Design a protein around this nucleic acid. Structure first.
Lengths: 206, 83, 105
RNA sequence: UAAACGAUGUCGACUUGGAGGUUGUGCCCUUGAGGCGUGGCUUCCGGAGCUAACGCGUUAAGUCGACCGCCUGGGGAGUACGGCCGCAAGGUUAAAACUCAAAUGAAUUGACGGGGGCCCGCACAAGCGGUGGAGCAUGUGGUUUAAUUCGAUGCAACGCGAAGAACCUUACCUGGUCUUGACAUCCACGGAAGUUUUCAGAGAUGAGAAUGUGCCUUCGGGAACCGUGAGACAGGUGCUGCAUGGCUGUCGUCAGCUCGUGUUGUGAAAUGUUGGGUUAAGUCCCGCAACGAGCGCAACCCUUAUCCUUUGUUGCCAGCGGUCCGGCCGGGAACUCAAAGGAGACUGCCAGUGAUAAACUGGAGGAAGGUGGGGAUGACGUCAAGUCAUCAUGGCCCUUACGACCAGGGCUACACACGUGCUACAAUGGCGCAUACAAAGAGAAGCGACCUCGCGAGAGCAAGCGGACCUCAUAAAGUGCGUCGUAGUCCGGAUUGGAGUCUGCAACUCGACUCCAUGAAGUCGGAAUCGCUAGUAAUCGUGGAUCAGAAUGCCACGGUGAAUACGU
């Protein structure tokens, strides 16, 4: 490889942790494994809910999983029954009386995960990716983000040869550690090969 | 270009013309042993970085396997022969 | 000013500024209405032919002084005098400054 | 007859310039040139114009006029035939059939370009320490075996995946066994599961014996699980890493890579992205048809150095008190220290050099001097580099089966070829005794103290500690004295034996270490090559990961702590 992951290197910088609990070595592995258990059956059950982040935190023997979604209505449901049923699936797969908080993700096409997911959604629907990848390229420009990069990976179009194309616009100073780079990836399970997508969102300095 | 390293003068006598000598007869970062080597040889006997360095290195470099009681005192004999 | 006050340390800001004011001698000369030039006056036509070329490309009248080497082709209001002997060109400069400063009347 | 060429017919006229050479000549210097003309020839720049462009440009390829010669896609072919000419020698005139869809000019980009320079770099120079010799550790190829599992296999594989192989492990094999399967879901039948059992087997399992039969029981059956029945299906460390994703190494923390707008060009395209310097730097100044911008460089992030503020414990003890004299306790909050925040370093200033500038050279202050130091951070792209065996995945393959379980044994087997090491090969020393000064870490099936036994692996008892509170843990090197006197040795520890000591169902395969006991090979190693410019090489210890147990390996910590640089 060549590149560092922009989000994790800024973990001690403007990018905040999306898993904030303090636990000892004894429960650290169990809590971390419990985090993956609650997360794996939280994104899978909300694959069409525009989930941006799933932040986990354990104040006192009860985790409070807040979900960043651009469409809270599908996650909340009618009068919060969907959060309620998801809550008791988290509550018994995490061992704690968990509760699920919800947060609207304003300006959805400006989220790294959502852009990666949105492109991935309309990528296996048998459409040409040149226009599809520009849609995230174009949409971000009118709504700020004075810097962005949307890279796609191998098996671009029905072919036996892998390709790569990224089509930068704006400025993406990934070397600058206070760049506040929103970055996330996704992969598309197409009938041929696997196509991974990678997007960087430069939401201004600090 | 850059100059050679400046070393503080030998504290024991406050003189710069002895520290460079004790640093090369030194082996394996054992300066403490080095005084046990040369001070017993010195306190009891009673460009400037090219020819002085090279010539004086030749003195130190022949005391590895000469086969006697101890080259700690043999080098004292060698410098006594030199002096 | 407030950049040195709040964001940048004084030393680094002062050096970047110190290396950067070198151009506002030309820049600040043009900000009264963001430029929008309507005429140009050039004292040495040949030595600054580039300006004449851009001006006539934009279809702008040109006020030029040509002596022996430059050409009247690029210019429309030619002033066939010297580009040197600073007294004469400064007299032209004072004259044009005045005659644009009673144009409003 | 010639590339007989300026590849440019002859003649005339007209149309801006600049720089020459050669040869006349007029005026005035009546010195020889001279200064100013004025002709002819001629070389080179360039304007308009012209040209496809290259170019030509008053010696036109401009603008015209007169006349002549010539051309009409490439090849066949300046060939055949005839004529004429010639001493044959050949020349000249000059076809066609046939075939091809081009052939061609000029210019653009960028590719070998074995005609260059320039710059930078422990790359060389200097110096330091080494590897290739040996014994072991590990890894790689090769030999056998059922298997010695698979992949990695120049620099960018070879103490690699594997950061840890007695079974399991482990993907391999021998044997036994199961076929909706050990693992997942769905349908049905039963029994609760669970617990106590035996018997045959190695177990997987099978044949039996007791208890239970728990919450609803809305009376079924669920709530769970187990066994069985047919089916879908499961399952695969199976195969393609040139199908891939993802992730990684690679040139290389090298400095370049491009874009917007402009400009130039009919145009492909060029410019930007250039010289001088300058930087570590496409770092930046100066003149430049380009200005800018993006990723690039720096810096922002972490650590370290000085100081300050805050808090003062489990940390410290400057002052006071006496001390079970030990910060031990009052007590002090000074100081170290601890962790939070700031200040401080910015060529800031000065001198000089340098274009005055960039920049550099030194100095001053400053703890830190010229990005003070070290980390993190790797541009477009480079290797169809590697991974399908971490995972995901396209296709392919076996579904009473390379599937699966179990037991066993493999994976560590050698006869070698080489890495990577450690042990070292000792008298800057080794052994014996007193023997001081570290940091950094970890500890609950745990670090485990004291004491006792114990030659020790150690064992028994068992305080404390989930921790600036106790343990790991006496750090060695170092110091003082004595001693060993070149002895293949007091070094060195392989190898081999008795017994252990711990871990586990179980260690011989194939654990570690020790008590005791061996005690060889190794006295510096071949061309060659590797790493290194400061707390750096070079030593010595410390802890941690993985880990029931299993570090010469890895990661991190400290102590002691060097020498060299003339330059490309």
């Amino acid at each position: 490889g060549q590149k560092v992951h922009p989000n994790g290197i800024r973990l001690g910088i403007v990018k905040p942790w999306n898993s904030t609990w303090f636990a000892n070595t004894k429960e650290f592995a169990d809590n971390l494994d419990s985090d993956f258990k609650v997360r794996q059956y939280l994104t899978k059950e909300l694959a069409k809910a525009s989930v941006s982040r799933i932040v986990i935190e354990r104040p006192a023997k009860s985790i409070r999983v807040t979900i960043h979604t651009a469409r809270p209505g599908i996650v909340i449901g009618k009068k919060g029954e969907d959060v309620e049923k998801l809550r008791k699936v988290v509550a018994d797969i995490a061992g704690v009386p968990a509760q699920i908080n919800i947060a609207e993700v304003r300006k959805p096409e400006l989220d790294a995960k959502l852009v990666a997911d949105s492109i991935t959604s309309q990528l296996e629907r048998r459409v040409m990716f040149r226009r599809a990848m520009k849609r995230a390229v174009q949409n971000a420009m009118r709504l700020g983000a004075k810097g962005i990069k949307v890279e796609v990976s191998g098996r671009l179009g029905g072919a036996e040869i892998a390709r790569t194309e990224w089509y930068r616009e704006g400025r993406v100073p990934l070397h600058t550690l206070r760049a506040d780079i929103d970055y996330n990836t996704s992969e598309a399970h197409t009938t041929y090969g696997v196509i991974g997508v990678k997007v960087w969102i430069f939401k201004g300095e600090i | 270009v850059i100059g050679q390293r400046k070393i503080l003068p030998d504290p024991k006598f406050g003189s710069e013309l002895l520290a460079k000598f004790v640093n090369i007869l030194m082996v394996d970062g054992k300066k403490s042993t080095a005084e046990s080597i040369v001070y017993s040889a010195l306190e009891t006997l009673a460009r400037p970085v090219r020819r002085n360095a090279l010539a004086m290195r030749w003195i130190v470099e022949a005391a590895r396997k000469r086969g006697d009681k101890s080259m700690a005192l043999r080098l004292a004999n060698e410098l006594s022969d030199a002096a | 000013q407030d950049g040195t006050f709040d964001k940048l340390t004084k030393k680094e800001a002062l050096m970047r500024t110190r290396e950067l004011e070198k151009l506002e001698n030309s820049l600040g000369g043009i900000k009264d209405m963001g430029g929008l030039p309507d005429a140009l006056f050039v004292i040495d036509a040949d030595h600054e032919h580039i300006a004449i070329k851009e001006a006539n490309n934009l279809g702008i009248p040109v006020f030029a002084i040509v002596d022996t080497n430059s050409d009247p082709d690029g210019v429309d209001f030619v002033i066939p005098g010297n580009d040197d002997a600073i007294r004469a060109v400064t007299l032209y400069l004072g004259a044009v400054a005045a005659t644009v400063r009673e144009g409003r009347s």
